[PDB]
CSV table of C-alpha atoms (C1' of nucleotides) in Angstrom, one decimal:
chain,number,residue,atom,x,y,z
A,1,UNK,CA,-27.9,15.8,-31.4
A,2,UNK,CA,-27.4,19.7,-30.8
A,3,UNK,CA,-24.4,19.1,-29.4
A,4,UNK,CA,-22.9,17.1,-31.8
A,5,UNK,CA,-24.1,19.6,-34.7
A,6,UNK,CA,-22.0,22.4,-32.6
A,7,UNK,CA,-19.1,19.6,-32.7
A,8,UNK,CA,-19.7,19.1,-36.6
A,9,UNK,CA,-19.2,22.6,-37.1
A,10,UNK,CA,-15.9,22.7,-35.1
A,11,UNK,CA,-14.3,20.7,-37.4
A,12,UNK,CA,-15.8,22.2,-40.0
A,13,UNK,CA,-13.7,25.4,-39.2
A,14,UNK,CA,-11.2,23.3,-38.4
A,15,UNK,CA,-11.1,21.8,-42.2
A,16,UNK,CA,-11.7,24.9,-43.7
A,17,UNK,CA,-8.5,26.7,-42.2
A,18,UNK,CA,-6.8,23.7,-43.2
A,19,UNK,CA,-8.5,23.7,-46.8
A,20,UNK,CA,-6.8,25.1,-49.9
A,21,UNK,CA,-8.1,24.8,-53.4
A,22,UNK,CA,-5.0,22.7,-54.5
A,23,UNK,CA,-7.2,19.6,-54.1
A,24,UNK,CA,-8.3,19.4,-57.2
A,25,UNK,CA,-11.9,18.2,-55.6
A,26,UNK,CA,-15.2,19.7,-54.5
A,27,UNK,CA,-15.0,20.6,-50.5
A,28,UNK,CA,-17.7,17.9,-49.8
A,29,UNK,CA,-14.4,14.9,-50.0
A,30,UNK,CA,-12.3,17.0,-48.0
A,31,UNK,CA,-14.0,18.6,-45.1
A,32,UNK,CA,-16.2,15.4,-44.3
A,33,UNK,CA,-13.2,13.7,-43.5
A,34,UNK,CA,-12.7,16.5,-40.5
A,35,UNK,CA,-16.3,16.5,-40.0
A,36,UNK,CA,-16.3,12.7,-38.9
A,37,UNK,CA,-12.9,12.8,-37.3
A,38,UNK,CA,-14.4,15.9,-34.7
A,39,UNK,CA,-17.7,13.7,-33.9
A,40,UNK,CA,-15.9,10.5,-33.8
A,41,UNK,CA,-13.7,12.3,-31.1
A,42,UNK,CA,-16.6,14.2,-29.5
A,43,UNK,CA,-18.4,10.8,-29.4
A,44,UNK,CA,-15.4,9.5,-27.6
A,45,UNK,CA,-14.8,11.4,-24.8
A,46,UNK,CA,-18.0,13.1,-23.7
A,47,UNK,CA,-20.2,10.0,-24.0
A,48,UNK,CA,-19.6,8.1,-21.0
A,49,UNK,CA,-19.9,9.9,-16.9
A,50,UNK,CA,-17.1,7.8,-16.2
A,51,UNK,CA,-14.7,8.6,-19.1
A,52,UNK,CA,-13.0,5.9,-21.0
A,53,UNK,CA,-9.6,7.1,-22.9
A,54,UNK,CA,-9.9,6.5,-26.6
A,55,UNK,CA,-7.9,3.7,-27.1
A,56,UNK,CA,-10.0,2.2,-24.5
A,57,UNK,CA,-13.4,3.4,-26.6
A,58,UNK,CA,-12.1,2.1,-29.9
A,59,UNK,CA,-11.6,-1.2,-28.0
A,60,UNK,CA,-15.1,-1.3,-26.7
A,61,UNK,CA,-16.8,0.1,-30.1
A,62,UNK,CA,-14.7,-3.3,-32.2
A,63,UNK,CA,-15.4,-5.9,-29.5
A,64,UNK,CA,-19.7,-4.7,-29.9
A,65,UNK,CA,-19.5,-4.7,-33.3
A,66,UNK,CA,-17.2,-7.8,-34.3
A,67,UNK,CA,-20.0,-9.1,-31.5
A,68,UNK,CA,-22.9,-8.3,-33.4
A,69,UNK,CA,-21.3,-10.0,-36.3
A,70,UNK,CA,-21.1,-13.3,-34.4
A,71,UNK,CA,-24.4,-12.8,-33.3
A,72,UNK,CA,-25.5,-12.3,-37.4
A,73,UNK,CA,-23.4,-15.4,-38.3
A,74,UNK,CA,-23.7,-18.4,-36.1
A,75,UNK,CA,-26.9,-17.4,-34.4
A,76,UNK,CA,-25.8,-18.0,-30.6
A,77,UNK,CA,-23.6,-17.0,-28.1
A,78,UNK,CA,-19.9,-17.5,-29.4
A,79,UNK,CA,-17.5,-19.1,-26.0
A,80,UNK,CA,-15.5,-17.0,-24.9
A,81,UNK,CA,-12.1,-18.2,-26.3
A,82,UNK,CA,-14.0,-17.7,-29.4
A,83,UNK,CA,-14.7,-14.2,-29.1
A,84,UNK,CA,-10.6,-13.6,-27.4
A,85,UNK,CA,-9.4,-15.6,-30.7
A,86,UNK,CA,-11.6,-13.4,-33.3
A,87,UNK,CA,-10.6,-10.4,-31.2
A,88,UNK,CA,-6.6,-12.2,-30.6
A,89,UNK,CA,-6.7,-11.2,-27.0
A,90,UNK,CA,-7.2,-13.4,-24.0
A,91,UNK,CA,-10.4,-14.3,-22.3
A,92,UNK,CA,-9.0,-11.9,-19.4
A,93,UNK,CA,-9.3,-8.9,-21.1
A,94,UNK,CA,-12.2,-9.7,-23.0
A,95,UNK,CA,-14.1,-9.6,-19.6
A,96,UNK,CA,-12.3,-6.7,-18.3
A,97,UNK,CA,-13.5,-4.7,-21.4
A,98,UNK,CA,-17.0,-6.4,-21.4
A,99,UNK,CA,-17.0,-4.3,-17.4
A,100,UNK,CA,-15.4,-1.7,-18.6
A,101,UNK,CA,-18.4,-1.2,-21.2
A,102,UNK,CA,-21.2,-0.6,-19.0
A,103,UNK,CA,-23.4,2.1,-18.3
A,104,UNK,CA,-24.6,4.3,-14.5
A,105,UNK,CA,-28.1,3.4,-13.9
A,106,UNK,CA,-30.0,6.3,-11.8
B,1,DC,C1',57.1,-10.6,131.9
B,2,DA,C1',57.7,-7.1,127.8
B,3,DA,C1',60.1,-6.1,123.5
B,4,DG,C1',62.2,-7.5,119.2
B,5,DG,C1',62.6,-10.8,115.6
B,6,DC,C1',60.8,-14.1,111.7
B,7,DA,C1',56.4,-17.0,108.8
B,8,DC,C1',51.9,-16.6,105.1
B,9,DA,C1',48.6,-13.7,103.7
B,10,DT,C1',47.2,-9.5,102.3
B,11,DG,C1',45.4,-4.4,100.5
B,12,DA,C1',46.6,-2.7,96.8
B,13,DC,C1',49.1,-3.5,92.3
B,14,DA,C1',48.7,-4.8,86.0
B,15,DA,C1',48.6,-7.7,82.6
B,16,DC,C1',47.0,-11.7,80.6
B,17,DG,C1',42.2,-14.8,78.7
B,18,DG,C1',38.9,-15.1,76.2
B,19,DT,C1',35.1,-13.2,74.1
B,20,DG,C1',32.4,-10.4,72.0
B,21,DT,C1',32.6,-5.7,69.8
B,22,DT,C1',33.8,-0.7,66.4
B,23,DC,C1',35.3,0.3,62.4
B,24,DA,C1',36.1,-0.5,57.8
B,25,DG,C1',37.3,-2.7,54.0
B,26,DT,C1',36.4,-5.6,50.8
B,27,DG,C1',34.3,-8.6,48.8
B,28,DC,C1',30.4,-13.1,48.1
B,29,DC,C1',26.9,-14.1,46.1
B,30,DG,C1',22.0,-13.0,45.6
B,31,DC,C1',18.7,-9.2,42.9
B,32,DG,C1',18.8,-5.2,39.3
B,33,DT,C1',20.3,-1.2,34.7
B,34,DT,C1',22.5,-1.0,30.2
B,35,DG,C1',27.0,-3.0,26.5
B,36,DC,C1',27.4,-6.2,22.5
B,37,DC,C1',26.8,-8.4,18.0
B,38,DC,C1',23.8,-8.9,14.1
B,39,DG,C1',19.4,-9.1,10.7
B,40,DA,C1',16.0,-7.3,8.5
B,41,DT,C1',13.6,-3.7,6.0
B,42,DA,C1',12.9,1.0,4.1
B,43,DC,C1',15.1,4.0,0.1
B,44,DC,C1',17.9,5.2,-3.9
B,45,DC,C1',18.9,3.0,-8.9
B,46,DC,C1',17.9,1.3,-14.3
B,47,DC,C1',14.5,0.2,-18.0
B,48,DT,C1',9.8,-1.4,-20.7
B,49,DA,C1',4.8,-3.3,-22.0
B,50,DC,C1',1.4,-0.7,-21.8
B,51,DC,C1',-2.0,3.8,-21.3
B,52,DC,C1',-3.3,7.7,-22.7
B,53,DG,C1',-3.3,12.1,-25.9
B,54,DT,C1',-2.9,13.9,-30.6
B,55,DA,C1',-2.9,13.7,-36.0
B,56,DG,C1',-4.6,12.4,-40.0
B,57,DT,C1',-7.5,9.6,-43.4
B,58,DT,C1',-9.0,13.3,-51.0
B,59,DG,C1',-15.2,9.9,-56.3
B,60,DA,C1',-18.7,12.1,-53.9
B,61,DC,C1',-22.2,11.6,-49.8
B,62,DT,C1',-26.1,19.7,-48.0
B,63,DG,C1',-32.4,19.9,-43.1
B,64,DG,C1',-34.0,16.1,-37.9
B,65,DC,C1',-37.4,15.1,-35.4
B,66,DA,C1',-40.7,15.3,-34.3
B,67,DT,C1',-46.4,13.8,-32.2
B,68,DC,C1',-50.6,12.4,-31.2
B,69,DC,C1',-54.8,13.0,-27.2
B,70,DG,C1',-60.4,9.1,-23.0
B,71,DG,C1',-57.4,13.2,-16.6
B,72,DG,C1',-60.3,16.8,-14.6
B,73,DC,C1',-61.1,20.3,-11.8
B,74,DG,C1',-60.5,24.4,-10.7
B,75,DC,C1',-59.0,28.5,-10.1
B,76,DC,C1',-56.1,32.5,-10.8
B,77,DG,C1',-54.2,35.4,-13.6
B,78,DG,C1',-52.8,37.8,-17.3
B,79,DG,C1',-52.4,38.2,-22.5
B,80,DT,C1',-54.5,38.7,-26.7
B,81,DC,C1',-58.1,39.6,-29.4
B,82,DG,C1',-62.7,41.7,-30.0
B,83,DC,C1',-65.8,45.7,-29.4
B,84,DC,C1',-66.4,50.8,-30.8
DNA sequence: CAAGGCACATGACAACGGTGTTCAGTGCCGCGTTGCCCGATACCCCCTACCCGTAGTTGACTGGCATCCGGGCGCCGGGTCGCC
């Protein structure tokens, strides 16, 4: 949690020297934007030991969520082609990124 | 009866007979050391579906998350507060 405070704040000066009063806004609509972009990122890269890129993380984040959704909807566990034709991928890479998702155990 | 004269054979005389030798040359016909000619495989070339890093997303949206117990003992040791 610390962490991602010190994070928040980066992009907060990030925004800020980025920010002019031209916006005709408060600063709460502008620098959140920065603010979620620099924990989205932070949340990205330093998460994982072994580091996913973050095309890769974006992948696994849609493929758990749409997931979840699945779950909500039908109640059971959607086949596979189903799951590759609401993502549009192939079943292939549905099971490489359902691998590549995992977690070390100690 | 003795001396001098002619036959046949005889001490050597070389040169053929015939065979097995000295060099020597060159092969004859068995064993070896390296010429082919290829054929494949390692090393350059171009681009391209995808991987990975970076840049933005304008109503607003301003303090978390705690912990929480039945040891239990026992001592050391020092710190803090009390005494005065």
């Amino acid at each position: 949690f610390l962490d991602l405070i010190q994070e928040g704040n980066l992009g907060l000066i990030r925004a800020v020297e980025k920010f002019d009063y031209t916006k005709g806004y408060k600063f709460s609509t502008y620098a959140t934007w920065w603010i979620r972009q620099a924990i989205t990122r932070a949340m990205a890269d330093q998460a994982r030991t072994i580091r996913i890129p973050v095309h890769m993380v974006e992948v696994i984040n849609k493929l758990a969520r749409v997931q979840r959704q699945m779950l909500q909807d039908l109640g059971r566990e959607p086949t596979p082609e189903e799951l590759a034709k609401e993502l549009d991928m192939t079943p292939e890479k549905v099971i490489e990124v359902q691998k590549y998702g995992r977690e070390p155990i100690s």
